[PDB]
């Protein structure tokens, strides 16, 4: 009776990005991969080392290629091995940090992951679908020695969809990303709010906003306004949620309005020169008392996604962790990994809504890393 | 746990097609629908007095619309009712008998089905409220829509296997006897209940969402009738279908076939058939996949119909496939669609009856 | 330098649909084909009678398949001939009258058409589909063997013709109300190569390939009928212009509003027993003037597409004339559809370059004169 | 009567890539762009200058957005400017050197091009994308502001130019071999309109799902020694060298080396793998590509033309290892298109090349037209 499965995820201190050791292949081995909230699928570099007794490449026009949504047939002029076959299916994979994309082949192999009643036994998808993507794609932008990307996007062979389908889980997943490199957070597949902590009602304040999917397969929500200490800075789906930037990203005109109203809410004298890659920094000794950021979601009548000033700030000298996305970012506002860390964020694919707590996880005395004991497993 | 779910399916003697009573809505009610093996999705006429407590039409750009692969937004300039909303998602539904297609609206409601047993549910089963003109011609009497079993993201088997965590496969046991009911079993039937002699052949899915296999040869009573660099190939070229009762052949294959079939025997053809008799029939052997392949065998009498006539039609110069196997060739034959392994399984101690398998 | 190309179009009185003879093949022959304004392409019956020295079925993955936007390969077991090949590309064709669709194969052959009255000029490699013959069985005017699509799709007639000869990316329909005189489709910039009372409204294309405009309001004798970052839910106009239906079609709620308001513009006593296929019929002779229907385009004060009431009326029986507006039920593809009868005796400029549809705000005086 | 249009394109010595100054906007200005033979469209960074009186961003669901194959609507939260509007269309653009792709906005403006040496003729409503600026940051030749695609895609350079002027649906490349020198792209039927094309041979052209031109190589020999097989082949200007899948690379480079004396080999200069002392070589081996099928026509590469001057006294084999999964097992780069007439016939789905060298007629690509 499997109701949840759970993947440990770690915060990479050097990049601010989140990544995981996936258990794949026969025998099981650890494959380090970026966690890309918006990614279409799981892809890894197979050009390398690849040992498995259970690896298979589906044939062109197969049900597996249809499920993966590719009718592009490929062939390789060379002895067959993972990544190189006669008559297989081709899939474009994306490095979401550089935005590079390249052509690889669809593969199947074992993926293993812990079940959890709400720690539990290790269960497997014996023919988990993924792509052997070309190696140039791992060369830039990813945490050291990452070999791939696990996409959690709403696409037919993404992690959440493949896991939910195989185990009959509710078609949703919950992220609890860690703020701290020293301790692993979790991604929970299945209905966490109903099937999952130690007397604490961590979901008590869950509120919901509608979820859309862009044509590029990204999760979008809609922000009705941004207020900083009750002063509105915006206006004047639409909002992407993403783990391919650590920081909040704002379209340039929104960036200028935001940062200026932010500054204004602090003492003018507290401003110091900026350290890269930030624009707006402060002497932190000079004032502890950061403005609160309310994102009013969907429509004027709430609910409110609250960001405390302190959690927007980076200990760089403290700097505002908000980036100028230029004239044409993909979304006018993007909530990045730091906005996800230490919050329970529910992506409900069945009902098309994102759930979020109006109150802080930590108010329960709980950190995302406290959720599961991965050291026993 | 649940590892098997079953839909009773009924043989309609007047059309030669099959149909199920789907259980939907709150409170549950019965929705007669044609079973279309290659259908993309379940659709229904929602002008047919739609009562439900649990009906929703997903909004444009939602997760459900994305899953159904539509980014087309619609609005109905009318009040709000099932099939008429503002800001919902459009999708094309097909009447696969007439081949008509029409733009309808993505809906969500409860569907109930039997486990193997008791009735279990998909609270959010996705389907389409299709335009009512699509139920006017060709369907079995009183049917209100079509339930698609094609390999497409919101087809019946995909939704059910995903919800219950079944093995990605379904088996077909249609009954030959008009008014009798066989079943479609979802999940790993071969391991979860006769499946000793399962041959197997590769399955491809066409761009239009149809199941294909490849037929290397056809014989009538042993007589031959038939016949990451990018590449660019084709599917099998033989379609399995329940949207025709009859075997359909490309004109030239049809001539060869029927003629050779005539020669295995010693009247005034009766419409729509081109070869009829008074009332031993020769056997048809289909070598599957390639020259070494397992053989799909249809005994002659099972091709034959009573207007007795050869139930093999002329699909003209350009049918979808060179060869199509219709409803009658699936009847009283256990056909396993393994979507996880991309192959179709079939029965090479007589056959019992599809109608014997269950009791509802 | 060729500036226009012109195709005569015949009104079939028996169906109200419009058809043309397309000149193709080598040797050149006539192929009678339905004119489908919203159709993706030209499709034609290749069932075995087809024969031509210049016909080829492009190979899968060819530039011609790429242009037609199909990467679906097929093959045929019989001896090779048009419609039947070893490695070709598949294309879905639609009968717009019955809404049947079916898979056929991309074909290529010579098409000839008159320049500007001028000589016959040719497109040597004109792309079209060999469609399954079941597609011609039903709903097509007599003897029709295919459908010429004028849709905004990459191998439609207007696009191929404009492209081959370097015409302006537009065409003008001037359908005839009278079967005995043929009207014209004019490819290229008709307004600058042949009146001035042209109004324009934005043109959008639906995902199924249809032309849409936006009707801000429908009025009858000025009375309102209709009615009282990734951007997300945008839609195209919501009014379709089609030559696949003869009459105006309205979604059932709009239909009822329209009929109630139309009727209110005339004496209740003039009404008479309904006569199929119609729902609102009148004692002819008890009416001197029928209400005008004004479609205000784009915005509440945009340009107006005006229909005279006489032109929306049909005479069914001896002394009884009926309203030529059909009930499209709950889910027509568009809430309002203007049909062949609304396009007859009017110039309509489909400008694909500027995405606008242009129509006269003073109809000639109520198409066959332009050419001969 | 316009039959050909020609674009001077210049060889960049640093990157080995080719680029062009496109004349756009009102008033006209020079917009430097990389020439990407497989590029889907023309894209530019609009953030920067963009001065024009004739720029326009089509609206969502317009005929222009449909042509470009996008039904994705964009809103920009800012005030109106090029690259930033409400209700426009989104298009993904690709930097073909880094393989980065990003979302930009469909735009329309004037593009001027020389007709035939002849006068500047214009496309008033030329479609392109305002692509996000991160796409220009790496790997393009210095100062280029975007990319001009020549792929077989509906709004590519050759398609828009052929359609606007009624050209034959083909183009010929004559890329110049020497740094800063100028070759030409000629749109229209170059072979029939200006024998240097007397010996044109032809091989089937296919288009991949990512929109790249492909042909098939049936075999490769070096000095008549078999290298391949034991043949999908992309033609590209986004790599300056030949690229081979790893097992083909190993065989090719081995056989190439053993045709030369083994003491000729010096230490490898990055990025190359096989380099030589250029004192110790007097003749390089011929590389022969049999196209399409066992008995097809032969694309001949003189071996000297495969070699790169890495240093003062060192010459390297300009053949790169594409690893396990390059897009095509063989790729013919910029260097293989240099000083060679290559005809991309989109109408007939074939690529044409001369069995006899352009230099054996005494001609160089830079000779064809006098630009300035």
mmCIF file of N, CA and C in Angstrom, chain C residues 145-178:
data_model
loop_
_atom_site.group_PDB
_atom_site.id
_atom_site.type_symbol
_atom_site.label_atom_id
_atom_site.label_comp_id
_atom_site.label_asym_id
_atom_site.label_seq_id
_atom_site.Cartn_x
_atom_site.Cartn_y
_atom_site.Cartn_z
ATOM 1 N N UNK C 145 -14.645 16.517 -57.181
ATOM 2 C CA UNK C 145 -13.613 15.491 -56.974
ATOM 3 C C UNK C 145 -12.575 15.904 -55.904
ATOM 4 N N UNK C 146 -12.839 16.989 -55.213
ATOM 5 C CA UNK C 146 -11.929 17.402 -54.172
ATOM 6 C C UNK C 146 -12.271 18.716 -53.569
ATOM 7 N N UNK C 147 -11.359 19.238 -52.754
ATOM 8 C CA UNK C 147 -11.580 20.499 -52.086
ATOM 9 C C UNK C 147 -10.342 21.415 -52.238
ATOM 10 N N UNK C 148 -10.531 22.625 -52.758
ATOM 11 C CA UNK C 148 -9.466 23.638 -52.744
ATOM 12 C C UNK C 148 -9.554 24.479 -51.494
ATOM 13 N N UNK C 149 -8.570 24.330 -50.634
ATOM 14 C CA UNK C 149 -8.516 25.111 -49.409
ATOM 15 C C UNK C 149 -7.889 26.473 -49.589
ATOM 16 N N UNK C 150 -8.541 27.512 -49.056
ATOM 17 C CA UNK C 150 -7.992 28.884 -49.130
ATOM 18 C C UNK C 150 -7.487 29.387 -47.767
ATOM 19 N N UNK C 151 -7.286 28.450 -46.870
ATOM 20 C CA UNK C 151 -6.866 28.711 -45.496
ATOM 21 C C UNK C 151 -5.473 29.262 -45.378
ATOM 22 N N UNK C 152 -5.166 29.781 -44.205
ATOM 23 C CA UNK C 152 -3.836 30.332 -43.976
ATOM 24 C C UNK C 152 -2.985 29.212 -43.430
ATOM 25 N N UNK C 153 -2.515 28.385 -44.337
ATOM 26 C CA UNK C 153 -1.748 27.203 -43.992
ATOM 27 C C UNK C 153 -0.735 27.110 -45.109
ATOM 28 N N UNK C 154 0.374 26.424 -44.881
ATOM 29 C CA UNK C 154 1.525 26.748 -45.723
ATOM 30 C C UNK C 154 1.384 26.238 -47.157
ATOM 31 N N UNK C 155 0.544 25.235 -47.407
ATOM 32 C CA UNK C 155 0.324 24.809 -48.784
ATOM 33 C C UNK C 155 -1.064 25.110 -49.308
ATOM 34 N N UNK C 156 -1.764 26.062 -48.689
ATOM 35 C CA UNK C 156 -3.059 26.411 -49.228
ATOM 36 C C UNK C 156 -2.891 27.028 -50.601
ATOM 37 N N UNK C 157 -3.978 27.115 -51.349
ATOM 38 C CA UNK C 157 -3.949 27.860 -52.616
ATOM 39 C C UNK C 157 -3.381 29.276 -52.555
ATOM 40 N N UNK C 158 -3.903 30.135 -51.671
ATOM 41 C CA UNK C 158 -3.392 31.519 -51.684
ATOM 42 C C UNK C 158 -1.899 31.623 -51.386
ATOM 43 N N UNK C 159 -1.449 30.827 -50.436
ATOM 44 C CA UNK C 159 -0.070 30.865 -50.088
ATOM 45 C C UNK C 159 0.819 30.348 -51.197
ATOM 46 N N UNK C 160 0.451 29.247 -51.854
ATOM 47 C CA UNK C 160 1.320 28.714 -52.898
ATOM 48 C C UNK C 160 1.359 29.653 -54.099
ATOM 49 N N UNK C 161 0.201 30.216 -54.430
ATOM 50 C CA UNK C 161 0.087 31.054 -55.593
ATOM 51 C C UNK C 161 0.840 32.371 -55.381
ATOM 52 N N UNK C 162 0.589 33.025 -54.227
ATOM 53 C CA UNK C 162 1.284 34.259 -53.837
ATOM 54 C C UNK C 162 2.779 34.065 -53.855
ATOM 55 N N UNK C 163 3.235 32.991 -53.206
ATOM 56 C CA UNK C 163 4.631 32.602 -53.214
ATOM 57 C C UNK C 163 5.261 32.356 -54.580
ATOM 58 N N UNK C 164 4.604 31.588 -55.443
ATOM 59 C CA UNK C 164 5.203 31.276 -56.723
ATOM 60 C C UNK C 164 5.384 32.504 -57.606
ATOM 61 N N UNK C 165 4.379 33.371 -57.658
ATOM 62 C CA UNK C 165 4.406 34.494 -58.578
ATOM 63 C C UNK C 165 4.822 35.800 -57.938
ATOM 64 N N UNK C 166 5.089 35.818 -56.638
ATOM 65 C CA UNK C 166 5.459 37.059 -55.983
ATOM 66 C C UNK C 166 4.334 38.076 -55.916
ATOM 67 N N UNK C 167 3.142 37.586 -55.634
ATOM 68 C CA UNK C 167 1.966 38.444 -55.486
ATOM 69 C C UNK C 167 1.998 39.022 -54.103
ATOM 70 N N UNK C 168 1.218 40.060 -53.850
ATOM 71 C CA UNK C 168 0.925 40.425 -52.471
ATOM 72 C C UNK C 168 0.197 39.284 -51.763
ATOM 73 N N UNK C 169 0.473 39.139 -50.468
ATOM 74 C CA UNK C 169 -0.040 38.021 -49.673
ATOM 75 C C UNK C 169 -1.459 38.274 -49.260
ATOM 76 N N UNK C 170 -2.338 38.234 -50.246
ATOM 77 C CA UNK C 170 -3.729 38.468 -50.022
ATOM 78 C C UNK C 170 -4.531 37.872 -51.138
ATOM 79 N N UNK C 171 -5.821 37.755 -50.913
ATOM 80 C CA UNK C 171 -6.742 37.374 -51.964
ATOM 81 C C UNK C 171 -8.092 37.960 -51.616
ATOM 82 N N UNK C 172 -8.912 38.061 -52.641
ATOM 83 C CA UNK C 172 -10.225 38.693 -52.571
ATOM 84 C C UNK C 172 -11.218 37.676 -53.142
ATOM 85 N N UNK C 173 -12.277 37.406 -52.395
ATOM 86 C CA UNK C 173 -13.369 36.662 -52.917
ATOM 87 C C UNK C 173 -14.458 37.615 -53.442
ATOM 88 N N UNK C 174 -15.099 37.205 -54.532
ATOM 89 C CA UNK C 174 -16.280 37.875 -55.056
ATOM 90 C C UNK C 174 -17.190 36.765 -55.574
ATOM 91 N N UNK C 175 -17.860 36.126 -54.631
ATOM 92 C CA UNK C 175 -18.737 35.046 -54.956
ATOM 93 C C UNK C 175 -20.004 35.576 -55.644
ATOM 94 N N UNK C 176 -20.509 34.795 -56.590
ATOM 95 C CA UNK C 176 -21.744 35.129 -57.285
ATOM 96 C C UNK C 176 -22.979 34.606 -56.553
ATOM 97 N N UNK C 177 -23.997 35.461 -56.455
ATOM 98 C CA UNK C 177 -25.317 35.037 -55.982
ATOM 99 C C UNK C 177 -26.085 34.177 -56.986
ATOM 100 N N UNK C 178 -25.703 34.247 -58.256
ATOM 101 C CA UNK C 178 -26.475 33.622 -59.340
ATOM 102 C C UNK C 178 -25.700 32.477 -60.008
#
